[PDB]
Design a protein around this ligand. Structure first.
Ligand SMILES: *[C@@H]1O[C@H](CO)[C@@H](O)[C@H](O)[C@H]1NC(C)=O
Ligand SMILES: *[C@@H]1O[C@H](CO)[C@@H](O)[C@H](O)[C@H]1NC(C)=O
Lengths: 47, 47
């Protein structure tokens, strides 16, 4: 993202309904079927 | 002023009370005491 320009008191920060689809409903294409568990030193069998 | 970037639906265009002073109340320093009248070809005695 572009660097911080400063506080803009006139920018409207509201959330749009299209943002609910672009961000949250899109993340489901990446959710896996199982999730691992790991040691502190490379051991995966459920800690 | 900078060139037109495009319609920003989120910019707040409201008028501020400081704009009433910066623009309108400042113009009084330039109003003259009398105003001329002119011909179409450089004649000033009240047309
Ligand atoms: C990794 O797991 C083994 C056995 O599961 C355990 O002995 C060891 O302490 C674990 N490593 C760490 C850093 O806790
Ligand atoms: C300028 O004024 C004179 C007399 O006041 C008049 O004869 C003349 O027509 C005027 N010029 C124009 C372009 O009207």
């Amino acid at each position: 993202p572009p660097e911080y320009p400063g506080y803009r008191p006139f920018l409207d920060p509201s959330i749009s309904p299209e943002f609910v689809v672009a961000s949250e409903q899109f993340l489901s294409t990446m959710v896996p079927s199982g999730v691992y568990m790991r040691n502190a030193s490379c051991h995966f069998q459920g800690i």
